[PDB]
Structure 1
Amino acid sequence: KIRIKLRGFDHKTLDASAQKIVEAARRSGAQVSGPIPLPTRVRRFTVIRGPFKHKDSREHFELRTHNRLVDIINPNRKTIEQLMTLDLPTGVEIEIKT
């Protein structure tokens, strides 16, 4: 019960809050199946380096979107007021699915 998925471009600030949420939920009862690392979606862009005309020669780019999963098996009112208020996301986004 209460599955929480968190995505991020930075894998550090992600795993960061990823645990911060875990360490929290436990700190109120409720079991929590550790943050599992779901596969990454890589989005790349290949552009001509030059503005004019030099088709051979380009620069690759990628926007790696990281995903982490965290399940708290048996929640309760205590494991809500925390994970429904107490935050810390700046470059990370979480979706709560009950």
Structure 2
Amino acid sequence: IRIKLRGFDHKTLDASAQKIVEAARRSGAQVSGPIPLPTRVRRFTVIRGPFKHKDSREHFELRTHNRLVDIINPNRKTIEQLMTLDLPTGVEIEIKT
């Protein structure tokens, strides 16, 4: 009954995190909402110039945002139509039960 949504850009996560949840809310029946899990962040810090100059760095970050949606009351009308969904490139899905 479980849907997991994961991407680098959140504004395309929330697009797709709503879109999947609208689908199952259509073809029956229970949607436990888009619950936004904490983001896992990997910062990259680096000296700016190619040589010496230690006291000047730059900060980069990488945000792997998380989402979860629970379609509880299945209704296998959902089991076919999800297999056909428009989920943009920068996003991953994991399906469990």
Q: Distance in 1 between matches of 2:88 and 2:75?
A: 23
Q: How many residues align?
A: 97
Deviation at 1:76, TM superposition (A): 2.1
For structure 1, the 5+ residue unaligned runs are: none
Task: Give % identity.
Answer: 100
- Select the structure that is richer in strand: 2
TM-score (norm 2): 0.95
Kindly report structure 1 stretches of 4+ aligned residues shifted beyond 6 Å.
none
1:87 Cα deviation after fit: 2.6
Q: How far apart, CA to CA, are the structure 1 residues paired with 2:85 and 2:91?
A: 14
Secondary structure of the residue aligned to 1:54 is coil
User: In structure 1, how many angstroms separate the alpha carbons of the residues matched to 2:58 and 2:82?
Assistant: 41
Query: What's the TM-score, normalizing by structure 1?
Result: 0.94
Q: Partners of 1:86 and 1:53 in 2: how far apart?
A: 51
1:77 to partner: Cα distance: 1.5
Cα deviations by residue, 1:28-73 (Å, 9 ceiling, x for unpaired) = 0120101001001011000110111111100000001100110011
User: What root-mean-square deviation, in Å, do the aligned CA atoms of Structure 1 and Structure 2 show?
Assistant: 0.9
In structure 2, C-alpha distance between the alignment counterparts of 1:43 and 1:79, rounded to whole Å: 36
Q: Which runs of 5+ in 2 are unaligned?
A: none
